[PDB]
Design a protein around this ligand. Structure first.
Ligand SMILES: *[C@H](CC(=O)OCC)[C@H](C[C@@H]1CCNC1=O)NC(=O)[C@H](CC#C)n1cccc(NC(=O)c2cc(C)on2)c1=O
Ligand SMILES: *[C@H](CC(=O)OCC)[C@H](C[C@@H]1CCNC1=O)NC(=O)[C@H](CC#C)n1cccc(NC(=O)c2cc(C)on2)c1=O
Lengths: 305, 305
């Protein structure tokens, strides 16, 4: 038992990480079949970053301007293309270590594992949520760009995130693997505000279920409440509204602990209005919102890859 | 920038995980060269667990009593041996995916990555400290045993932990890969005491350095203190004593932030005696002790594998 912030095994993704160089600029690429995916700002100097014309900069580039290294091996680029904010470099060799993969666009509150990379070499793996405002609280130094976020489904890697930049407060912004930013962000060095972030309510309830499952029960109360009553309180504390969809998603956990979703909502209400008053839940002194209901079941029932 | 609990890339360890079955009992094995390492309690029924004689139970077993699956493939056991609390099954095949590895025994406060496994299949990867009392706060269900903890050194996997059991309060106990328990624990189903745990002081100071590096500086003071002065306060809060060795280890971070170790010790003193007054440090509401000074530099300077 016990509850940890757990990332998926990075193996399948490690064998897709390559180094992409264009003049000065070197960052990380994702090699799937005979295609290498990287942020398009690989073609920029740090001067260009104030206001780049990516169309113009790319027109000036040819295949041999793009160096791709997969460990010690060099990959012959035989074509290049720009899809939104990612670059697609066609290469002579299909990746022998290509896993079964999809590209998916995750929704706010959904979580994924980041494999942080520098020079196409895996550095470390951690777990993230897409925040309500479409930022992520990641760990990224310079060179990290092209590092990707993913979920695993037995054998199938679903790629949801490629990292492009840091914002004010050093939160992070990036794209799906089709190169569309999450949120209103642009791959340009300007003033960009993320705007107010909210707590992922369905995730906090999942986490309280994880607590109860692990013997952390001090916060359970006699009260129940209406979905309506609860939301009126949640709005006040910058919690995202709880929907019938969220209640239906929390059902199996409801059923495994024998605590009605609206019973737990009543518990959460107390904690928001009264505070945790010095005490802890699964050793955290604040309410944790980066475990989905699927994360809690995966971990608490132990699904394997 | 930003600071996360980061595990090492699990790839090299995923290709060493196999499934070991002995009658009823199925748990995880580590396949390195032509040897599979697992907890010796694989040979126990839940009756034997109250008070096993492992010598006698093993005498009763032959090679064909041991089923080893590496994915879909079956491995012929051609010898079996007991080293303390691990079982060494000799097999016909050397592991083609064996990485460069050492076996090391870590010290209290040292951290490592756990690859949690069920039926020899990687489930998830997270970061742990060996607590002062030689427990770990992991996440382990039934079937998890034989899951291992490791650090990576560029290309070399150092294995330090194999998981054997849960204790009271659902903390976890295990062995090095030579089969010697960390702490006073035995592989037997009895009531076992971990005894008092202490906060890993050198790790909390490393973490405060990580904070300052990431713009979290509200807790800085002008004060300094003696090692002796500081320890007289630390003892009171069940913090491990800070040694000159700890001060010397914190030097590079000292140098990167330009804050003398004993200046930061004076900051920590304030936080213990005054509390955090409801504010946060790297988004934590308590003081974090599971980042080593090496962890903080790895992440904050971005070292690669
Ligand atoms: C990409 C790193 C890389 O490999 O690309 C160049 C080799 C980085 C990732 C950053 C670096 C620090 N932490 C991260 O998460 N992204 C950028 O550097 C982007 C590139 C683009 C497009 N970029 C460029 C220029 C400026 C900024 N950021 C800011 O202007 C800014 C403002 C505030 C406040 O904080 N940052 C940027 O992200
Ligand atoms: C090994 C799992 C495995 O793969 O082996 C079975 C095929 C488990 C790991 C445990 C299960 C729950 N969480 C874990 O970390 N280890 C055991 O089950 C060990 C076996 C040995 C040796 N074991 C056996 C019997 C009892 C206990 N538990 C306790 O002593 C205990 C007391 C209190 C309170 O909490 N736990 C045990 O770990």
């Amino acid at each position: 038992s016990g509850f940890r912030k757990m990332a998926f095994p990075s193996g399948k993704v490690e064998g897709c990480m390559v180094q992409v160089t264009c003049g000065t600029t070197t960052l990380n690429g994702l090699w799937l079949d005979d295609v290498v995916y990287c942020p398009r700002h690989v073609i920029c100097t740090s001067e260009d970053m104030l206001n780049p014309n990516y169309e113009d900069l790319l027109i000036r580039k040819s295949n041999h301007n793009f160096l791709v290294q997969a460990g010690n091996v060099q990959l012959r680029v035989i074509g290049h293309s720009m899809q939104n904010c990612v670059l697609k470099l066609k290469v002579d060799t299909a990746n022998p270590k290509t896993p079964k993969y999809k590209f998916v666009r995750i929704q706010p509150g959904q979580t994924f594992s980041v494999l942080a990379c520098y020079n196409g070499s895996p550095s470390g793996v951690y777990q993230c949520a897409m925040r309500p405002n479409f930022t992520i609280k990641g760990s990224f130094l310079n060179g990290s760009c092209g590092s990707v976020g993913f979920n695993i489904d037995y054998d199938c890697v679903s790629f949801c995130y490629m990292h492009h930049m840091e914002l004010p407060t050093g939160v992070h912004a990036g794209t799906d693997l089709e190169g569309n930013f999450y949120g209103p962000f642009v791959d340009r060095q300007t003033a960009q505000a993320a705007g107010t972030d909210t707590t992922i309510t369905v995730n906090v309830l999942a986490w309280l279920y994880a607590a109860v499952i692990n013997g952390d029960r001090w916060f359970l109360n006699r009260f129940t409440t209406t979905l309506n009553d609860f939301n009126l309180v949640a709005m006040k504390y910058n919690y995202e509204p709880l929907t019938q969809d969220h209640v239906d998603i929390l059902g199996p956990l409801s059923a495994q602990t024998g605590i009605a979703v609206l019973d737990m909502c009543a518990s959460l209400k107390e904690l928001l209005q009264n505070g945790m008053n010095g005490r802890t839940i699964l050793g955290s002194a604040l309410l944790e919102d980066e475990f989905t209901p699927f994360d809690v079941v995966r971990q608490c029932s132990g699904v394997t890859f």
